[PDB]
Amino acid sequence: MEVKEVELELSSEATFLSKTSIGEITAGEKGLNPMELLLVSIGSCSGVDVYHILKKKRQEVKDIKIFLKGKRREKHPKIYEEIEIKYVAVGKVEEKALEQAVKLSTEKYCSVLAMVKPSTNLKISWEVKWEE
Amino acid sequence: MEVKEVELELSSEATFLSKTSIGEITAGEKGLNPMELLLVSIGSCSGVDVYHILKKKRQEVKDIKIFLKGKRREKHPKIYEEIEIKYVAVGKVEEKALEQAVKLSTEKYCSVLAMVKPSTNLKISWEVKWEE
């Protein structure tokens, strides 16, 4: 069982300097928004899967863009009642390969997404922009 | 319903420049680890609640340190089977006030934590270091 550890310390009003393996970032009221950071965690975790799978499937990737939009409940806790994720692969990428990468990620490999999936409505979409 | 949006773009091998409201950070294989970022999101979201509550309860806070440790499953998806969170309030803070702040956050206000709670075993602890 892999162990991950992070440590936070107050940096400014309701803001924390957050220590991770690659460095420290400020998260909170006067720093990176925590809920926006959750979307970043989801997007990057899944993006890593998609990148590796597309590569394994011999696709020529020039760029991968991921757009996440979350809609929050109005009462506490204000969790995301809905999260929309759109994957855009740019390059010589076949729609079938992108679809397989997105499904494998969202249904089997993405650890972050797997943890919040049971508490929100997930809407996933993707598209390829064929470019040389 | 508040809407949060973030956009990611490939920056390096399996890494993404992630655009948020305060700026851009690199998340992925060669940047901030996605699962570590999830812990940062949880810690900072809750930390914001604790800060505000302690302030409301008239506590004199010199510092707030939050330690998160996550243990991952060995098979995919490698979600955190357990997440330990330790809150340390430093200053003229009464243990009773910290306890109330931690419980209100973890049980009602923390949006990020509320979303992953149903998929993991949460172990919460706290302590005060009385300092002038």
UniProtKB/TrEMBL annotation, chains A, B:
<protein>
    <recommendedName>
        <fullName>OsmC family peroxiredoxin</fullName>
    </recommendedName>
</protein>
<dbReference type="InterPro" id="IPR036102">
    <property type="entry name" value="OsmC/Ohrsf"/>
</dbReference>
<feature type="disulfide bond">
    <location>
        <begin position="45"/>
        <end position="110"/>
    </location>
</feature>
<dbReference type="Pfam" id="PF02566">
    <property type="entry name" value="OsmC"/>
</dbReference>
<dbReference type="InterPro" id="IPR003718">
    <property type="entry name" value="OsmC/Ohr_fam"/>
</dbReference>
<dbReference type="InterPro" id="IPR015946">
    <property type="entry name" value="KH_dom-like_a/b"/>
</dbReference>
